[PDB]
Symmetry: C4
């Protein structure tokens, strides 16, 4: 019974580590192989290692375990020429990106079918958006019929317009299907997470009964309504913390408040509204190309690097604006005659006659010039302010290009590199120090495959998760002494039963 | 009595750590919550961790404690279209930047009121300067009446000029109020710091009595006058180290010498003189925009990065100047005919006929070109020196752009990154190793919330500060044995009473 | 007998380290000095240290030892004006780069002669290619005889064309000789490596007998034919795992499948086909200049840096393409009139009338401009969309130049630096921690020249290799107890006989 | 007798550390304060810490001690508008840069006077060169009298030409004086160093008597003549390893061979020859401006960064040349018509008609363009090879600008940063781990000012140096037991008498 037996180590009343054996049913291990729960697990370890909250690590692990229980129970419910180059480039890009009662029963079966393949639905939506964007590359504009008129250039196939129309139709349909699948699959997970957070806060902190909700807490203030609900716990296990009559209005608006406040739900709603707007104008479908950035981990890291140092970037942009304003002040006061940008002398284009123009001209040209503001303005040849302009142009070029723009670029690059290094450090910590007790890697490295054996069966996270399922399923009376102790102390919400400092090998190294 | 009881650990005559309990009055803990003293505290730990002076760490801590006593006693005395885009950008910028006897009594009350809100006064001055600068963006120039004449463009509101005049008036008034508040609030702090430094030097080093003041010490030489003063100690506690008759002239000029030598006082005087000059010309108010750079920590770090490697930057600039001079020598000797910058052949603009022109032209164009001096000068097509110019232009472009400018930019970026890393390391050390004894983080990390308990009550800096207040207030006779010992050895100015290597937990780990 | 005596340390049945002495013949040590085996050794340590496979380190060492045995047995079988500047540059470059039965007997002697000097043959081929490329620099084109006609400019020597023809002839001949030498020298090595891998897999894993070959394994599926061969082991020692009749067809096609799947053989075949194509057009010889990149370690690292982050680079390129497509969409929808690139107004060159042109124009100009797409397009002077274009051009310039291109350049630079740092770390580990037991450097550093003595004789890799040769040559009956034990346990393919944790010095430090 | 007493720690026959006291004469400590010996000391520690030769550290220290003895004995023998901006810039630059028998007796006194102030003489030479270069900035050229004629522009002072002539005269005179001072001051030091190296090699290695001098050793082969000299040891202490008659010819040419092979002597000879050439043409004095680069440590590091990665830089330049040659091949074969650089169509300037022109044009324009070769060549508008040129220009721009030039710039920047980090690490090691025994910093940091006391008197390098002087001066008979033992074992040239692992504090920590 190698795959039906699980080994876990807990510290008991004896103040020493003790390994116990519990039966693992095939159903519990079967649900662990779903890609969704595996991705959630990887996200959990990534987040906890990045945060570094060792003190609250056990609480986060327990929350992750409860989230896994909810995910697998949900899965149980849902269980049954130039165009040639353009085509080549699109194919190359796609490739990597690639890499009564009976009516109610039918409706819930269709909803479960939609929930079963939701990532596949998102992939199909991405493919439809990519195809639509590729089709849009053939658009042409001309005054003559096929004001400005946008038409399609005559292609060899000739089926371009009906193909685009059909692709837009299935794109809208698949966006609706994806939002329905998300509402029926991942929305209950966040609903249960918020209900558990509220229940724990009310039970162990008195957030409402023993204290005020507080200030600057939208979630806390909004959560005020759930308490009076006849069903405050609906997606959380602890339930003791005719369709119109059964539905409770306050619970419905509360739950809706949870959904529309979710980031993923908001993103999917934005996708749906962009798909709807794409019918008014086909060029609106280009907004769906951003799903490549979110889907790819590297592109997501690139996007997050911009907001990683948002405060510092904003401060640097403000400093650059102040510096450019000072230089514009100096130019307006002393160097107005050098800002003529018209070749013809009949109508000179004075760019520094007004301060806003001198400011807009500076901010648009000097920053992007790469050699300073002196390149655009007239060269100081024979002027009485020759040394003064030369100094002005050298100082502007230096202080802007070599410092201000360089600082911003270095900040963005450093944020991206820091995020990549954080991911690499998370991976190295996971493959070096085990998650359960975090003992040194060399101690197990002395024994051949010591760390592999320590993580596979001795301190496997899946083993503890399956132990939690087994404790939940098994009755209190049938629990053994160690099982009863661990269950009673788990209901106490105090996690010192983990191996913590040491394991079985360290305790009895001489015996082993 | 949880908040009225303080626990501190000191090493006594028994050569072992010993925790003692002292009563904490509510008044002492109340004054600790002022933002000014908290900011001074953060600055103190930042400076001491950056310096790394572990040997003199206790002396710096004692000096900080005395400065806190003086700060809280002072607080006790003072205790009672295009314009739409421009508006949007200004609002966004501002946002972050933001985020007889009776007469004498009235005068001192007004002065205390000014001192109470000094940071708020500085914020109001910054807002006034920002508003004035925003107003100045609408300035326009034209020969015709509203020589060159500067007038205001016709705006929709039409209240622009009176608003600017009033804003300048309140800007000058608030600058005067801010300088008065600084003179009445922070000037006594630096006065007391200098008086304590002088007293300690005279008592424990014989800087004047037992030795010469020295050379290249402006502060030491100037401090010569305070000694003869009938009031050498005026803002320092150790006093034993009719208005015209009461005031001592020598003390007055000495104190004034302290004030005008202060960096912050000099900066505020520069602000005041710029505000005064702004009435002569409204464009002079742009100098006040630099307060954004000083106020923001990131912008202050950016400014300090320039001067962090000032010597290396100056040496690199000198090397670049020497290289450009050598290239100018070569061009003047061999490549004079290639420096014609006039399209019309009637009046050629020979830029290398004179060595200073060839030098000024090189230093202005070749550095900022980004592709070398060869871009500006005529291309060597068919010339007898084709290979020689090509080599000259390649060598110039390489040695300047790829090396000299790159070295300067990398030096600035490295200075900025080093300052940011120093701040991050200071923060990590503060949140990892406690300031009092500096024991390892893992030792307390073995016990859950061990470091938090160790820093909150076991080795709290505020606890030692409150103990110092309690010792100062309590009489010598009422002092206990440990209190008398610590007071007598504090008057000895020798700080080995700190826990130093170990604490209570390490000493009696088995018992605990 | 200093050079004829070898000392090695092994752990035996006594569970303690034990050094034994074995006779080293001069023949075994003589073959160790060949540059080929030394380069293979350096590559082996570099690869194993870079991989970091400590658990499989001993298996890799045993494989390297077997490869060395095969290499030395193979060696036993084969044992017996502007042109002046161009010339100066070519010489400087080359320098650094520089740095019946009797018939069968004659044929095998010629083949052995070719195999003896193969690196020299490659160097001669590189010299011939460099000379041909230098000759090609004098090519000129003109319509007139010596359609477009390519001829040779009249040189002072006048022997240019016959020299080029002869150089091409010997280049083709030396390419053929090099491919023959590689087939007769290094092809048997890879053949033996694949045969040993197959034998080990079949013996210890049941890859075919006890299991399926698997999926996505071209080598495993192709290796299916060798099994039925009457000679499955031909270049592997374990042989028990009329020319037409002797040759086995299945073995011949299997072996050929091994050769044409080799990277080095494929590269040499590409070299040969390029040499053959160079006769059709002499400009095809420029492909042979890539051998400089492969030959030089620094240039090879530079090339490998591009593919080190290939996935991230592809993702970044895709993100850049998506961003440029979005900007092209915006320009086509709103800023079509600003894309006129024709000076003459009679025939405007509308670059954004068609979406593909606007996309191709963007991807070709905006990326390489360095200041954004605004430089190429007309300046927005007086247009109703002045603020909108300014924002468009600033956002494009920022998001492309400062982020997208900077990220790609930083990724390439970081990959190159990471490869260089990996090589430096491999070297530091080799010169700091010995390969055999990996004890600390300081422990031997306490004793003067402790590490040198520990690596020269105590734990020399060459010593273990020579011990392996001595065990192979010596009969089983004549083996000593330790030798018999090590041989029997080596046939068990379990490598715990290495010193592993400790050596002789650590075991008996007090005695020593 | 605090400054006349020295404490050193040595390990004796008892195998334990033992501190002994020796009398320090005032003369020995007086000579230690010369700036020359201090700079030599700093250079010695910098070099030894950078090298990391712990095994040979004691030998290097002994060599440094002997060099100090020779330096102090030598000192004993020698002991007795636009021009306004240009002036401001020159002053600012200079500032930082700033920061019978009786006849023989007179000649040797003059030589000693020259040797006494040699750094001052070099500073005066640098000032003269800077003044001459500043004067040269006023040169002007014109056809008319004051072929091309170089004259001086009319200045306000009018004394420019005689001042320049006099400055050149004293520059030549001071260069001669500096070379004489170097010959009489530092040349004997290198002579003694080479004589000691030869003596040690002959005594302890048999470089000539017991073996051949070797190959690729210019110093070893040249040193062959000194052996037969009647005075092989002339500047080395171990002398037992009529002017025309006294001088030995072979020794004279040998010594001259030592001098002209020295780097500093060669640099000073180059300075002298440049000064001599400056009289023929005053513009030749610009070569002396390089002394700023050598004098300043930062500028010297900048110069050394170029040659730090010389091999890698050469390989990268060769790879860039090969890539540019391949691109030129492609352009010549397919894109010849796009290389017209003449605005007038009457005489097109075909830049790719000849391969060398296409190669020279590519290497001069594409590298320095910053946007690729596509900017200079005609835009592909409507051509049949539109996609092919676009791909060609994108690939060229990427592979050159983003990779090849970026790699070179990053290599130079990394070399400079590595040199700066090496200097910083040397400083940190010196201020953290003492040079003598290298014990941990924390061990002495436990005791207040423990490291300061450990380095000032316990393990002072100057203390060991003064002990060496005292042993040299004191007779063998008067030596004490420890002194006799250390002297006899120093003549054995084996340095295990250093404290090495531990010191007095570690040996008797309980007693202390």
């Amino acid at each position: 019974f190698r795959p039906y037996l699980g080994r876990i180590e807990i510290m008991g009343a004896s103040r020493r580590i003790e390994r116990i054996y519990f039966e693992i049913s095939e159903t519990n291990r079967a649900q662990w192989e779903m890609p969704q729960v595996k991705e959630s697990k990887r996200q959990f370890i990534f987040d906890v290692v990045n945060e570094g909250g060792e003190a609250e690590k056990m609480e986060l692990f327990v929350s992750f375990c409860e989230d896994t229980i909810f995910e697998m129970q949900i899965a149980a419910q849902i269980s049954e020429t130039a165009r040639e180059a353009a085509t080549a480039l699109a194919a190359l890009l796609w490739a990597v990106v690639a890499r009564w009662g009976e009516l109610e029963v039918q409706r819930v079966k269709f909803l479960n079918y939609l929930s079963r393949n939701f990532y596949t639905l998102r992939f199909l939506a991405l493919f439809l958006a990519f195809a639509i964007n590729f089709i849009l590359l053939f658009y042409k504009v001309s005054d003559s019929p096929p004001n400005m008129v946008y038409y399609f250039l005559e292609e060899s196939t000739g089926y371009m317009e009906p193909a685009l129309w059909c692709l837009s139709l299935l794109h809208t349909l698949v966006a609706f299907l994806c939002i329905i699948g998300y509402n029926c699959l991942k929305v209950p997970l966040v609903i249960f997470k918020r209900e558990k957070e509220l229940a724990r806060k009310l039970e162990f902190d008195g957030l409402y009964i023993t204290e005020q909700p507080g200030d600057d807490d939208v979630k806390g203030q909004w959560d005020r309504l759930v308490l009076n609900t006849p069903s405050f716990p609906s997606n959380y296990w602890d339930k003791f913390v005719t369709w119109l009559m059964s539905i409770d209005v306050k619970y419905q608006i509360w739950k809706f408040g949870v959904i529309f406040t979710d980031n993923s739900f908001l993103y999917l709603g934005w996708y749906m509204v962009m798909s709807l707007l794409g019918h008014y104008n086909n060029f609106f479908f280009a907004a769906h190309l951003l799903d490549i950035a979110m889907g790819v981990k590297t592109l997501r890291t690139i996007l997050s690097s911009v907001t990683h140092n948002g405060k510092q970037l904003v401060m640097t942009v403000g400093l650059l604006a102040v510096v450019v304003y000072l230089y514009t002040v100096v130019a307006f006061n002393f160097f107005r005659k050098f800002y003529n940008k018209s070749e013809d002398e009949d109508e000179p284009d004075m760019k520094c006659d007004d301060m806003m123009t001198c400011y807009l001209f500076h901010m648009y040209v000097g920053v992007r010039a790469g050699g300073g503001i002196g390149d655009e303005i007239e060269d100081p040849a024979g002027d009485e302010y020759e040394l003064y302009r030369v100094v002005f142009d050298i100082t502007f070029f230096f202080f802007v290009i070599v410092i201000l723009l360089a600082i911003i670029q270095g900040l963005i690059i450093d944020a991206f590199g820091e995020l990549r290094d954080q991911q690499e450090q998370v991976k190295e910590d996971m493959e070096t120090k085990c998650f359960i007790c975090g003992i040194g890697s060399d101690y197990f490295d002395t024994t051949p495959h010591g760390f592999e054996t320590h993580t596979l069966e001795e301190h496997n996270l899946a083993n503890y998760m399956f132990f939690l399922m087994y404790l939940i399923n098994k009755d209190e009376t049938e629990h053994t002494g160690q099982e009863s102790y661990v269950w009673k102390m788990y209901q106490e919400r105090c996690w010192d039963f983990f191996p913590a400092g040491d394991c079985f090998r360290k305790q009895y190294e001489d015996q082993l």
